[PDB]
Amino acid sequence: TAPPAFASLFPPGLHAIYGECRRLYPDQPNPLQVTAIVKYWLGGPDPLDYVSMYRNVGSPSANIPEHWHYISFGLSDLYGDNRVHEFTGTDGPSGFGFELTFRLKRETGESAPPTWPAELMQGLARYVFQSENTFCSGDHVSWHSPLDNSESRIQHMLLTEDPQMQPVQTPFGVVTFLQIVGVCTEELHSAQQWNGQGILELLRTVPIAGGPWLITDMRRGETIFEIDPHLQERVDKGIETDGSNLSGVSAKCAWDDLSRIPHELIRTRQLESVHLKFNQESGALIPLCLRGRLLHGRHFTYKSITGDMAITFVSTGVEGAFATEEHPYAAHGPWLQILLTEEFVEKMLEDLEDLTSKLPKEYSWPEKKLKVSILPDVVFDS
Secondary structure (H helix, E strand, O other): OOOOOOHHHOOHHHHHHHHHHHHHOOOOOOOOEEEOOOOHHHOOOOOOOEEEEEEEOOEHHHOEOOEEEEEEEOOOOOOOOOOOOOOOOOOOEEEEEEEEEEEEEOOOOOOOOOOHHHHHHHHHHHHHHHHOOOOOOOOEEOOOOOOOOOOOOOOEEEEEEOOOOOOEEEOOEEEEEEEEEEEOHHHHHHHHHOOHHHHHHHHOOOOOOOOOOOOEOOOOOOOHHHHOOHHHHHHHHHHHHOOOOOOEEEOOEEEEEOOOOOOOOOOOEEEOOEEEEEOHHHHOOHHHHHHHHHHHOOOEEEEOOOOOOEEEEEOOOOOOOOOOOOOOEEEEOOEEEEEOOHHHHHHHHHOOOOOOOOOOEEEEEOOOOEEEEEOOHHHOOO
């Protein structure tokens, strides 16, 4: 409602973001910042000009922890004179369309916010700029490193809309706010197997993880599923409902013929009977591959990590597949495409209590000439 001091100095882009900040925190008009002094468009390594570091009381009254809030400047068009972003105009997204935020739970000893998350936001922005790929709500980041650089359990990231921050209309476009959320490797794998938003919704329930504002505690030693097993059950139901985002996986697998691009020999062979082979972990993905993908009219690919051999499960819905309901087992080279009808896969699932919820475990369908075997990995090692 009241303007900032020395307003004519601030660029209109930067002005609108700081507008949203002042709204949230009228108490701190001078929050500690991390500033880039060697600018990115001059040769500097850091794409983010400023990182404001606020403090939020939270609502322990409503069971929301006290935490440090971080907000970036640079990902959106701040200056609007084509120095780093092409001037888009008011319509559409400003710059890359968003600025990062992050919420780190306050520990003791902290009279001030740590600065490592600002350095993380730098490295994270380095990807966006060097690849021009744009993140949105639900997207994940395989960081494969403890975020604070600590030996901490939290090694990956999920991206959500910031609960407090409202999208703003700069004279250069709209700017949404994507809040970074730290996650465990296993919780990242869940978000790969199912949508990102649904896993976010799960994290919101568990207050320690967690919480409705998705505050990151780096001290968290166990995953949401170790905190609560009943959540594991709520994932599959979603994979049944929404489907799976995971389109394939590199894993120890093989396929054998039971019949009695490119080479290019100008022909591809079809098979009457087929025998598929998997490990424990790879064979443990079948339910989601079937229930999650084929029942949703999508496909799934297994590739062997050791060498050249692939199996692509296709539903009758896909296009371009060389396997039809009439000749369902078709192979080009060592790439086998298997086509399974919606009626047959429902039957397959009822014959598959795979995760017991001993090897080798074989499954036969003489009615369809299919044999799937789950066996120890020392085989594919050969």
